[PDB]
């Protein structure tokens, strides 16, 4: 992301590659997580569903 301020950042997912089509009806839980490093064992910081 960009530098984090009190003002929320712009839409991080506004790019065209962040799209999905669901093959079954119902409730689908879309989650978003924040890490610090780009490697696998990086510490989770926050999550939102």
């Amino acid at each position: 992301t960009g530098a984090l301020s009190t003002t929320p950042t712009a839409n991080l997912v506004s790019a065209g590659t962040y799209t999905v089509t669901y093959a079954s009806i119902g409730t689908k839980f879309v989650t978003l997580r924040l890490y610090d490093s780009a490697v696998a064992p990086g510490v989770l910081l926050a999550s939102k569903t």
Binding site: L4, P8, L32, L45, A46, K48
Partner: peptide, 6 residues
């Protein structure tokens, strides 16, 4: 802390 909207 981090405040997220989605």
């Amino acid at each position: 802390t981090y405040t997220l909207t989605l």
